């Protein structure tokens, strides 16, 4: 019937002390972390029935954990497999889960959560069903509802209870819409947690003490949530309240503004579930939440995002692209060659991770403006309070900006970031390869030059490797490690560990002209320039770029990268093939150079720039390219950009440039800002949804529809054809 | 189709302003009862039992405007209990929609004599007080791309190329032609002054009028419910437009006022039996629509549809009356159909006198009956822009 | 000139008020679901030919405010030229939308029109819109406002209907509604409500208590601010009001929506539509607003005169079961044969969603006329404020 149920191991250890306070300790024996899986659901089922059977001898409940973490996440292996026809089962599972928590909530007696570590997603949903929360203020402990980052939503009462606690607007903005994670200090600050303790060993004693106190001091309110009290008033009002109803129509528009019109259905569903839930009783609200959850799990966006930010990402973090058998090797002193916006950004994220950096340039005047990049960033962090003055001084003191080459002694890690010129790098590497440590890693931040060719300018080619960062280095999370044919599996693994040590994610890439990121983002930019040269309105191109899910529209990105750099890449590719049919963008690139506009570096590009700030599209742009003369459908412009990168990613997978679809997805997402809803430029192929079908087969159908209209470059490779 | 519908009377109250308005103390029911009692004064021997229905438009029918205010007017004023009473809401066109529906009821033949019009006391029931799914429910709001009319109006001016001076020039033209009409006695017989239960005067003129408006004073105003991300939402659909030029202020947009209007409509046989004289004939009506993001371009297709329906062209029409919601909406309509300037809102419009959402359609409908009569002209076309991207138009011929 | 024909008439089930299945469904969704069913039946319909959408709604506030008809047009993806207008004539609002649709089609200035109504009384209770007749004390004191439940009891007092009598009609409505459901009468016209995932929410009328007995109806207590003294001030010859109406012999408070398609014969022929019934006549009348619920009798008389018909010419009579005495009064006035009156049960069993009832019982008779292979049906509702709406349909 309608029960707390529906072979698996028992997950919850039961203990009732001499006072009648039950301690439910969750300890799933199948892994290191308590997961909301079919095993837990069964265990919590039995335990809730028992709390009701022995209700006479029970005065309170405490929920604790035996793992390092409290309770984290759901059974993603199952949710990624739910088809649209499985929506019946999904709805029943989350309703059963919430029926248990609701019974625990209305037990007639206080329930306290003893949060010893990470309480994430389903884990925090368990604690929100309790009447009091206590958190052990320990390192690495986090609390939040990160379901929206996997394309899901807090379906175990997260949306309903947080809205009951904080109101519609605050619960959405602070907790639900972006799945923000909070350290226990910040958690208590916003009302997610109630009180803190120093160590975990104090939790259960402090919980049983709080139950003992609550029963005597508040006898009528024990085990009664604020929203189950008569006369409850939702913070900020209900949707019928006139104050909230005046601003409520702007919540879906403000969200459409933040997401730039991209097809992410998860934040949309969360806002809908929140507002509709706040219109009805708590039990009707939680059922609405179930339907919006099943609406997401059976959808394709959720499967993409679950594949990327869970399976693919965990495969990379676990050393999937790291060579097997190799051992760790510590890093003591980094040496950055060049103090440009890259070398300065490399000097900042290297020192923020605790490493002693030596930052050289061609002059003490330019190396000081380079370390000043780390100072102007440490001032934004002290003004906003994110760092103390003592840790901000220990950070900038590990940077030593110089112009001499002698003070490069003791460096066991060189990340060169000089100009993009081969013999220049051969010179810069030649004059340090012997006065730095003998067997140190030799790294280059080149964006197009083959690492094989650069490796011949040093003697120890086995320690020469590509270590490609992205600007701004402080905010971009990827590190593209380029494996030249002389690089050994140890240097590969050593830079792999260096990337994980500075809080970034590594992909490993075989050596090829353009690598992965630059080559792929080239096809993205060139698709927009071609459209501009075809007479399409620039405002439509930027709108197509923003509405496709990209973090920055293409013509805006074409200013950040120099248009002269693109011309250089095009001359290079033509040199190679001749020793090639040109891309239509190459005429736009040179034409823009001929007019003297080339981007932010020139203060004039597709946009106009007043005293260093971007300000509007260039008005002359429409006359130059006869803009408006071509008006294709917006979705055609959107698909032209997405398909150019997706097709180019398959070419890289075909050529051995990439070794896994995990690296192609996380690489495209974290490196070149490929839209997260796609799950990566490789997932986009197997998870395409359009009018005419869904899957890899429909991707080809749409690929040919685009190839028949805009050029044969949109023709799929054979590896996609059965 | 058989019976022809005729307008027999078309009166209205003065429009009282929103801030410190004279009409703020009058319940919107009493504004309607006042018009009913004037109709009894004009025709004391009218057999009210021949009035089969009372159709009042109302956009925010809550509070003092809820519970079917049309029927409340029927019972309060002492009309026969057989006279019905129904409220309707088609946003800004609810006043003209009540009149079109009354006419269509007469044409079907199953109704004889219908009272029609609207009421809106925006100083007591602010627009939005009724709520609504298109706004307050995020699931469908995210889909219909809801945008306040004030932003679609600015989008119109951005697309067609109407400068701030252009829209302020129309605003001045409206204030001028409204002040000319009032001093020339054009409104003497139709604007029924509002009084209290003692017969003391409350209002006898359109308080919102600023007849001393100057083109320099309009340029001093600041552009204008719109404080979220609505600008970015609109340009997501209108992706070829880079920036929205916010040209609309409180001096070139429709004023927020209280008011009510009544129109008496019946068949040829209906008025003859009661000794009434038909003043105009309802030639044709049409509703259409356009994109609801830029929701105010509705008047253009609805006017074309009513001209093809009545077998007429733009040249055949003597007077055009489009509701002055926003100055750009009128300039667009004028630019689209090449409306001659000397034949457009020739007594001023809502920018000067105000726009009582529920009552405006019947107010400007009755404005053209009097101007057709005063000019001895033949045909007038009345149209309004509607929220949600709708359009409503009506052709009347003088009799 | 033109003749108005009914081409489709569908309705959602009616979910009850306490712990209702539809309580979580926004009323806008109910209407959209019916629009999508019309699409399923006629996928090649040119929706551009739908010139208007006319919905009745007694409480156009909250989830039902802001012209819910236009919201249904945009949310369902219908053409923007399809109009959309809400109207409120209290209980008759649903049928009034259908009448107006027909009269619009007869005038010639509309081609194809959707009409109906929606009322989610569990989300938007009646009275949520306020109203002058109720809340303004000057005009409340002057129209002698009295809730309908008292007028219904007053009707039973004057006409001599006992508690047994009103209860006996209640038992009969439950029996006839249950027999219609089990007979499959409603299979094609009641469209089950589903969620965004296709999971079922409701596929039957939950307010039905088909195991009703005369003994259980007598166990109920009557609904009974001094409105009783107000009524007897006008009906001064009546000494005391006999309070016979309970929740068992009065209309149920439910959620539901109904949709009807109406057009000319030319409009239907252009879209491949087969007409199911013809709108013969409509009439609006009224009676004393204190007793409030005697409007059906004069409205039905007017429409029979206007159509050149009499009681003997009508095969089926369907009057909204607002209260038991209202139907008994109507049956006594016009001497309606018992076997012609509310043959498939009514609002006492299945519920009375204010804005939608008129379009529901209208569609119930289009179906029953086709099933019995009969000719005519007269549909009427008592209206708050003393009004009355009647309509005659003829099968085609
Ligand atoms: O505003 C009414 C229309 O809403 C939807 O269309 C809007 O949203 C679409 C999705 O991005 C856009 O393509 C479209 O341009 C917008 O108008 C709905 O799809 C339409 O059927 C409605 O008419
Ligand atoms: O003033 C109280 C009177 O109330 C009733 O009169 C009203 O009857 C209708 C409304 O119920 C309308 O015609 C109008 O509002 C009143 O005439 C009652 O009939 C009278 O006897 C009372 O004096």
mmCIF file of N, CA, C and O in Angstrom, chain B residues 140-202:
data_model
loop_
_atom_site.group_PDB
_atom_site.id
_atom_site.type_symbol
_atom_site.label_atom_id
_atom_site.label_comp_id
_atom_site.label_asym_id
_atom_site.label_seq_id
_atom_site.Cartn_x
_atom_site.Cartn_y
_atom_site.Cartn_z
ATOM 1 N N UNK B 140 4.459 29.295 -16.613
ATOM 2 C CA UNK B 140 3.968 29.864 -17.861
ATOM 3 C C UNK B 140 4.497 31.267 -18.128
ATOM 4 O O UNK B 140 4.592 31.669 -19.294
ATOM 5 N N UNK B 141 4.832 32.027 -17.079
ATOM 6 C CA UNK B 141 5.479 33.324 -17.270
ATOM 7 C C UNK B 141 6.787 33.169 -18.039
ATOM 8 O O UNK B 141 7.094 33.970 -18.930
ATOM 9 N N UNK B 142 7.566 32.137 -17.705
ATOM 10 C CA UNK B 142 8.819 31.849 -18.393
ATOM 11 C C UNK B 142 8.607 31.511 -19.864
ATOM 12 O O UNK B 142 9.535 31.660 -20.664
ATOM 13 N N UNK B 143 7.404 31.085 -20.242
ATOM 14 C CA UNK B 143 7.133 30.638 -21.603
ATOM 15 C C UNK B 143 6.518 31.714 -22.492
ATOM 16 O O UNK B 143 6.879 31.811 -23.668
ATOM 17 N N UNK B 144 5.596 32.525 -21.966
ATOM 18 C CA UNK B 144 4.879 33.496 -22.787
ATOM 19 C C UNK B 144 5.751 34.732 -22.936
ATOM 20 O O UNK B 144 5.399 35.682 -23.647
ATOM 21 N N UNK B 145 6.895 34.711 -22.258
ATOM 22 C CA UNK B 145 7.861 35.804 -22.261
ATOM 23 C C UNK B 145 7.193 37.107 -21.831
ATOM 24 O O UNK B 145 7.171 38.094 -22.565
ATOM 25 N N UNK B 146 6.625 37.088 -20.625
ATOM 26 C CA UNK B 146 5.885 38.244 -20.134
ATOM 27 C C UNK B 146 6.783 39.473 -20.050
ATOM 28 O O UNK B 146 7.904 39.409 -19.537
ATOM 29 N N UNK B 147 6.280 40.594 -20.557
ATOM 30 C CA UNK B 147 6.998 41.865 -20.551
ATOM 31 C C UNK B 147 5.976 42.976 -20.342
ATOM 32 O O UNK B 147 4.952 43.005 -21.041
ATOM 33 N N UNK B 148 6.192 43.892 -19.394
ATOM 34 C CA UNK B 148 5.227 44.981 -19.194
ATOM 35 C C UNK B 148 5.065 45.802 -20.463
ATOM 36 O O UNK B 148 6.008 45.979 -21.239
ATOM 37 N N UNK B 149 3.842 46.298 -20.666
ATOM 38 C CA UNK B 149 3.524 47.041 -21.881
ATOM 39 C C UNK B 149 4.470 48.217 -22.093
ATOM 40 O O UNK B 149 4.810 48.551 -23.234
ATOM 41 N N UNK B 150 4.919 48.847 -21.004
ATOM 42 C CA UNK B 150 5.807 49.998 -21.122
ATOM 43 C C UNK B 150 7.116 49.658 -21.821
ATOM 44 O O UNK B 150 7.779 50.559 -22.348
ATOM 45 N N UNK B 151 7.506 48.388 -21.836
ATOM 46 C CA UNK B 151 8.747 47.990 -22.490
ATOM 47 C C UNK B 151 8.510 47.606 -23.944
ATOM 48 O O UNK B 151 9.342 47.890 -24.809
ATOM 49 N N UNK B 152 7.376 46.969 -24.241
ATOM 50 C CA UNK B 152 7.014 46.759 -25.631
ATOM 51 C C UNK B 152 6.800 48.069 -26.364
ATOM 52 O O UNK B 152 7.114 48.188 -27.551
ATOM 53 N N UNK B 153 6.273 49.074 -25.660
ATOM 54 C CA UNK B 153 6.092 50.391 -26.259
ATOM 55 C C UNK B 153 7.430 51.019 -26.618
ATOM 56 O O UNK B 153 7.583 51.599 -27.700
ATOM 57 N N UNK B 154 8.411 50.918 -25.720
ATOM 58 C CA UNK B 154 9.748 51.407 -26.033
ATOM 59 C C UNK B 154 10.380 50.593 -27.154
ATOM 60 O O UNK B 154 11.124 51.136 -27.979
ATOM 61 N N UNK B 155 10.094 49.288 -27.204
ATOM 62 C CA UNK B 155 10.614 48.462 -28.289
ATOM 63 C C UNK B 155 10.031 48.887 -29.630
ATOM 64 O O UNK B 155 10.730 48.874 -30.651
ATOM 65 N N UNK B 156 8.748 49.258 -29.649
ATOM 66 C CA UNK B 156 8.135 49.775 -30.870
ATOM 67 C C UNK B 156 8.875 51.018 -31.345
ATOM 68 O O UNK B 156 9.287 51.113 -32.507
ATOM 69 N N UNK B 157 9.062 51.986 -30.443
ATOM 70 C CA UNK B 157 9.755 53.217 -30.804
ATOM 71 C C UNK B 157 11.181 52.946 -31.256
ATOM 72 O O UNK B 157 11.708 53.663 -32.115
ATOM 73 N N UNK B 158 11.817 51.913 -30.700
ATOM 74 C CA UNK B 158 13.167 51.564 -31.126
ATOM 75 C C UNK B 158 13.170 50.984 -32.536
ATOM 76 O O UNK B 158 14.045 51.313 -33.346
ATOM 77 N N UNK B 159 12.194 50.131 -32.852
ATOM 78 C CA UNK B 159 12.166 49.483 -34.161
ATOM 79 C C UNK B 159 11.798 50.486 -35.249
ATOM 80 O O UNK B 159 12.518 50.638 -36.243
ATOM 81 N N UNK B 160 10.671 51.183 -35.083
ATOM 82 C CA UNK B 160 10.205 52.094 -36.121
ATOM 83 C C UNK B 160 11.038 53.366 -36.202
ATOM 84 O O UNK B 160 11.038 54.026 -37.247
ATOM 85 N N UNK B 161 11.741 53.727 -35.133
ATOM 86 C CA UNK B 161 12.609 54.887 -35.164
ATOM 87 C C UNK B 161 11.964 56.156 -34.650
ATOM 88 O O UNK B 161 12.171 57.238 -35.210
ATOM 89 N N UNK B 162 11.182 56.039 -33.581
ATOM 90 C CA UNK B 162 10.520 57.185 -32.972
ATOM 91 C C UNK B 162 11.402 57.743 -31.861
ATOM 92 O O UNK B 162 11.644 57.067 -30.855
ATOM 93 N N UNK B 163 11.882 58.969 -32.045
ATOM 94 C CA UNK B 163 12.751 59.583 -31.055
ATOM 95 C C UNK B 163 11.942 60.054 -29.849
ATOM 96 O O UNK B 163 10.708 60.081 -29.858
ATOM 97 N N UNK B 164 12.666 60.430 -28.792
ATOM 98 C CA UNK B 164 12.019 61.003 -27.618
ATOM 99 C C UNK B 164 11.283 62.290 -27.972
ATOM 100 O O UNK B 164 10.222 62.587 -27.409
ATOM 101 N N UNK B 165 11.835 63.072 -28.902
ATOM 102 C CA UNK B 165 11.137 64.267 -29.363
ATOM 103 C C UNK B 165 9.881 63.915 -30.151
ATOM 104 O O UNK B 165 8.891 64.653 -30.096
ATOM 105 N N UNK B 166 9.899 62.799 -30.883
ATOM 106 C CA UNK B 166 8.720 62.397 -31.644
ATOM 107 C C UNK B 166 7.562 62.061 -30.713
ATOM 108 O O UNK B 166 6.433 62.525 -30.912
ATOM 109 N N UNK B 167 7.828 61.255 -29.682
ATOM 110 C CA UNK B 167 6.764 60.828 -28.779
ATOM 111 C C UNK B 167 6.299 61.989 -27.907
ATOM 112 O O UNK B 167 5.111 62.097 -27.580
ATOM 113 N N UNK B 168 7.216 62.883 -27.527
ATOM 114 C CA UNK B 168 6.822 64.083 -26.799
ATOM 115 C C UNK B 168 6.054 65.059 -27.680
ATOM 116 O O UNK B 168 5.260 65.851 -27.163
ATOM 117 N N UNK B 169 6.270 65.016 -28.998
ATOM 118 C CA UNK B 169 5.496 65.860 -29.900
ATOM 119 C C UNK B 169 4.045 65.402 -29.971
ATOM 120 O O UNK B 169 3.131 66.234 -29.997
ATOM 121 N N UNK B 170 3.812 64.086 -30.003
ATOM 122 C CA UNK B 170 2.442 63.584 -29.972
ATOM 123 C C UNK B 170 1.774 63.892 -28.639
ATOM 124 O O UNK B 170 0.597 64.268 -28.602
ATOM 125 N N UNK B 171 2.505 63.715 -27.535
ATOM 126 C CA UNK B 171 1.958 64.016 -26.217
ATOM 127 C C UNK B 171 1.465 65.454 -26.137
ATOM 128 O O UNK B 171 0.387 65.723 -25.594
ATOM 129 N N UNK B 172 2.247 66.392 -26.675
ATOM 130 C CA UNK B 172 1.810 67.782 -26.737
ATOM 131 C C UNK B 172 0.570 67.926 -27.609
ATOM 132 O O UNK B 172 -0.372 68.643 -27.249
ATOM 133 N N UNK B 173 0.550 67.240 -28.754
ATOM 134 C CA UNK B 173 -0.601 67.305 -29.648
ATOM 135 C C UNK B 173 -1.865 66.814 -28.954
ATOM 136 O O UNK B 173 -2.945 67.390 -29.133
ATOM 137 N N UNK B 174 -1.748 65.756 -28.148
ATOM 138 C CA UNK B 174 -2.907 65.225 -27.437
ATOM 139 C C UNK B 174 -3.415 66.214 -26.394
ATOM 140 O O UNK B 174 -4.615 66.507 -26.336
ATOM 141 N N UNK B 175 -2.513 66.737 -25.557
ATOM 142 C CA UNK B 175 -2.905 67.726 -24.556
ATOM 143 C C UNK B 175 -3.567 68.938 -25.200
ATOM 144 O O UNK B 175 -4.533 69.489 -24.657
ATOM 145 N N UNK B 176 -3.061 69.369 -26.358
ATOM 146 C CA UNK B 176 -3.632 70.528 -27.038
ATOM 147 C C UNK B 176 -5.037 70.236 -27.553
ATOM 148 O O UNK B 176 -5.978 70.987 -27.272
ATOM 149 N N UNK B 177 -5.197 69.148 -28.313
ATOM 150 C CA UNK B 177 -6.496 68.845 -28.906
ATOM 151 C C UNK B 177 -7.530 68.476 -27.850
ATOM 152 O O UNK B 177 -8.733 68.660 -28.072
ATOM 153 N N UNK B 178 -7.086 67.973 -26.696
ATOM 154 C CA UNK B 178 -8.011 67.715 -25.596
ATOM 155 C C UNK B 178 -8.469 69.016 -24.946
ATOM 156 O O UNK B 178 -9.648 69.163 -24.602
ATOM 157 N N UNK B 179 -7.551 69.969 -24.765
ATOM 158 C CA UNK B 179 -7.929 71.263 -24.206
ATOM 159 C C UNK B 179 -8.798 72.061 -25.170
ATOM 160 O O UNK B 179 -9.688 72.798 -24.732
ATOM 161 N N UNK B 180 -8.554 71.935 -26.478
ATOM 162 C CA UNK B 180 -9.412 72.600 -27.455
ATOM 163 C C UNK B 180 -10.825 72.035 -27.419
ATOM 164 O O UNK B 180 -11.804 72.788 -27.478
ATOM 165 N N UNK B 181 -10.951 70.708 -27.322
ATOM 166 C CA UNK B 181 -12.271 70.088 -27.289
ATOM 167 C C UNK B 181 -13.055 70.516 -26.055
ATOM 168 O O UNK B 181 -14.272 70.729 -26.125
ATOM 169 N N UNK B 182 -12.374 70.650 -24.915
ATOM 170 C CA UNK B 182 -13.067 70.986 -23.675
ATOM 171 C C UNK B 182 -13.549 72.431 -23.677
ATOM 172 O O UNK B 182 -14.660 72.719 -23.216
ATOM 173 N N UNK B 183 -12.732 73.356 -24.186
ATOM 174 C CA UNK B 183 -13.145 74.754 -24.234
ATOM 175 C C UNK B 183 -14.193 75.004 -25.310
ATOM 176 O O UNK B 183 -15.031 75.898 -25.155
ATOM 177 N N UNK B 184 -14.168 74.233 -26.395
ATOM 178 C CA UNK B 184 -15.154 74.345 -27.448
ATOM 179 C C UNK B 184 -16.471 73.663 -27.174
ATOM 180 O O UNK B 184 -17.332 73.609 -28.057
ATOM 181 N N UNK B 185 -16.651 73.131 -25.967
ATOM 182 C CA UNK B 185 -17.896 72.504 -25.581
ATOM 183 C C UNK B 185 -18.179 71.175 -26.237
ATOM 184 O O UNK B 185 -19.325 70.716 -26.196
ATOM 185 N N UNK B 186 -17.170 70.540 -26.841
ATOM 186 C CA UNK B 186 -17.390 69.264 -27.516
ATOM 187 C C UNK B 186 -17.920 68.209 -26.555
ATOM 188 O O UNK B 186 -18.713 67.347 -26.950
ATOM 189 N N UNK B 187 -17.503 68.268 -25.292
ATOM 190 C CA UNK B 187 -17.817 67.247 -24.304
ATOM 191 C C UNK B 187 -18.943 67.658 -23.363
ATOM 192 O O UNK B 187 -19.167 66.983 -22.352
ATOM 193 N N UNK B 188 -19.659 68.742 -23.671
ATOM 194 C CA UNK B 188 -20.640 69.274 -22.729
ATOM 195 C C UNK B 188 -21.797 68.305 -22.507
ATOM 196 O O UNK B 188 -22.288 68.167 -21.381
ATOM 197 N N UNK B 189 -22.248 67.625 -23.560
ATOM 198 C CA UNK B 189 -23.431 66.782 -23.450
ATOM 199 C C UNK B 189 -23.127 65.353 -23.018
ATOM 200 O O UNK B 189 -24.040 64.657 -22.557
ATOM 201 N N UNK B 190 -21.880 64.900 -23.140
ATOM 202 C CA UNK B 190 -21.549 63.503 -22.886
ATOM 203 C C UNK B 190 -20.851 63.262 -21.557
ATOM 204 O O UNK B 190 -21.038 62.196 -20.961
ATOM 205 N N UNK B 191 -20.048 64.205 -21.074
ATOM 206 C CA UNK B 191 -19.344 64.024 -19.807
ATOM 207 C C UNK B 191 -20.300 64.398 -18.679
ATOM 208 O O UNK B 191 -20.640 65.570 -18.502
ATOM 209 N N UNK B 192 -20.736 63.401 -17.915
ATOM 210 C CA UNK B 192 -21.752 63.587 -16.884
ATOM 211 C C UNK B 192 -21.034 63.836 -15.559
ATOM 212 O O UNK B 192 -20.369 62.918 -15.050
ATOM 213 N N UNK B 193 -21.138 65.033 -14.976
ATOM 214 C CA UNK B 193 -20.434 65.309 -13.716
ATOM 215 C C UNK B 193 -20.864 64.369 -12.600
ATOM 216 O O UNK B 193 -22.037 64.008 -12.477
ATOM 217 N N UNK B 194 -19.891 63.989 -11.775
ATOM 218 C CA UNK B 194 -20.111 63.084 -10.652
ATOM 219 C C UNK B 194 -20.504 63.898 -9.430
ATOM 220 O O UNK B 194 -19.837 64.881 -9.083
ATOM 221 N N UNK B 195 -21.582 63.487 -8.776
ATOM 222 C CA UNK B 195 -22.057 64.121 -7.556
ATOM 223 C C UNK B 195 -22.177 63.077 -6.451
ATOM 224 O O UNK B 195 -22.012 61.876 -6.677
ATOM 225 N N UNK B 196 -22.460 63.548 -5.240
ATOM 226 C CA UNK B 196 -22.564 62.686 -4.079
ATOM 227 C C UNK B 196 -24.034 62.408 -3.766
ATOM 228 O O UNK B 196 -24.936 62.732 -4.547
ATOM 229 N N UNK B 197 -24.284 61.805 -2.601
ATOM 230 C CA UNK B 197 -25.649 61.508 -2.188
ATOM 231 C C UNK B 197 -26.442 62.758 -1.829
ATOM 232 O O UNK B 197 -27.652 62.658 -1.597
ATOM 233 N N UNK B 198 -25.800 63.925 -1.787
ATOM 234 C CA UNK B 198 -26.471 65.183 -1.487
ATOM 235 C C UNK B 198 -26.623 66.081 -2.705
ATOM 236 O O UNK B 198 -27.210 67.160 -2.589
ATOM 237 N N UNK B 199 -26.112 65.668 -3.862
ATOM 238 C CA UNK B 199 -26.121 66.510 -5.037
ATOM 239 C C UNK B 199 -24.968 67.483 -5.134
ATOM 240 O O UNK B 199 -24.943 68.297 -6.067
ATOM 241 N N UNK B 200 -24.021 67.435 -4.202
ATOM 242 C CA UNK B 200 -22.855 68.302 -4.268
ATOM 243 C C UNK B 200 -21.883 67.787 -5.320
ATOM 244 O O UNK B 200 -21.741 66.579 -5.526
ATOM 245 N N UNK B 201 -21.210 68.718 -5.987
ATOM 246 C CA UNK B 201 -20.299 68.351 -7.060
ATOM 247 C C UNK B 201 -19.043 67.688 -6.508
ATOM 248 O O UNK B 201 -18.498 68.100 -5.480
ATOM 249 N N UNK B 202 -18.596 66.641 -7.199
ATOM 250 C CA UNK B 202 -17.334 65.982 -6.907
ATOM 251 C C UNK B 202 -16.328 66.175 -8.033
ATOM 252 O O UNK B 202 -15.148 66.445 -7.780
#
